[PDB]
Each structure stands twice: as C-alpha cells, then as structure tokens.
C-alpha cells in the first residue's frame, strides 16, 4: 500500500453521520452548521474514512459563518455523495473542490 490505500479502521456506525450531513446541512442551517458539524463529525472520524468523507466534511466545517459559509458546491457534492454512499461505494474526484487529488491529480 504505497500509492493506493483503502484500509479502514475499526468502526461501528456511519450512515447516521451521513444522515446528519443531509438533514443537518439542508434542514438546519447550511452556514450555521460548519461549527456545529465538527462536533458530530469528529465523534465518528472512521465513518468518513470508509468512503473518503473526512476530506470533504473537513472542508464543510472550514467555511462556517462569515467565511465561505456554503458555496452550494460542497453541500451538493456531500449530499449527492451521501446519496452515492448510502446507495453505493464508488466515489469520484470531488476533492477538486478543495485541492484535487482523489486518484489522478493531473490525469493526462
């Protein structure tokens, strides 16, 4: 495992963390959620290390009130990812939203 690594640690639940990412993000306060996110997002880091949501949710938390708040491009990307996660495992290069390097950074 030098270039490719998919060794997830010992976890328990994950869909529930997504469940927040969806209703938390869309049915609570898109901008007033980055600071409230971190709390629940840190309790289940291993869930975000299954499909690669850590990298994304960290970015959602990064905005917070006052800053980027919510470009709609991260959420739509995260929610749509939940919908992909909850209904699949194959994930795309969504890291491009904040430093592209999911699999092929350059991709010739």
């Amino acid at each position: 495992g030098s270039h490719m690594s998919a060794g997830e640690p010992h976890e328990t639940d994950c869909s529930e963390i997504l469940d927040h990412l969806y209703e938390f993000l869309d049915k609570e306060m898109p901008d007033s959620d980055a600071v409230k996110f971190e709390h629940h997002f840190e309790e289940s880091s291993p869930c975000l290390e299954k499909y690669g949501l850590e990298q994304a949710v960290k970015k959602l938390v990064k905005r917070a009130a006052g800053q980027d708040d919510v470009p709609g491009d991260l959420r739509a990307k995260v929610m749509g990812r939940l919908d992909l996660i909850r209904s699949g495992q194959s994930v795309p290069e969504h890291d491009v939203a904040a430093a592209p390097s999911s699999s092929a950074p350059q991709e010739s």
Side-chain angles (χ1 to χ4, degrees):
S2 299
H3 198 82
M4 199 179 178
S5 297
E8 64 191 78
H10 292 273
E11 333 93 338
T12 73
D13 315 281
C14 185
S15 294
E16 301 186 88
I17 288 280
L18 320 178
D19 193 85
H20 329 153
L21 267 300
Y22 205 114
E23 314 189 271
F24 202 114
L25 189 44
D26 232 70
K27 268 84 194 285
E28 227 179 272
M29 245 160 177
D31 57 274
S32 239
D33 280 337
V35 174
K36 322 218 281 160
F37 275 149
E38 210 270 288
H39 314 304
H40 326 274
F41 288 15
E42 202 265 289
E43 71 115 274
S44 247
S45 204
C47 156
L48 354 159
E49 310 227 58
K50 272 107 104 66
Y51 309 87
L53 229 51
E54 22 144 47
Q55 325 235 94
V57 296
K58 296 345 187 78
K59 268 30 113 126
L60 305 202
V61 172
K62 188 167 93 173
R63 64 216 172 171
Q67 227 190 94
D68 280 270
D69 268 46
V70 42
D73 199 88
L74 305 163
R75 184 254 308 282
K77 216 107 272 180
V78 77
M79 306 223 301
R81 189 123 159 173
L82 154 145
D83 187 272
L84 138 59
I85 293 158
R86 69 113 184 162
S87 201
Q89 71 196 266
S90 209
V91 279
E93 55 262 275
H94 280 165
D95 296 79
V96 66
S101 57
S102 68
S103 190
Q106 205 275 285
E107 205 180 90
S108 58

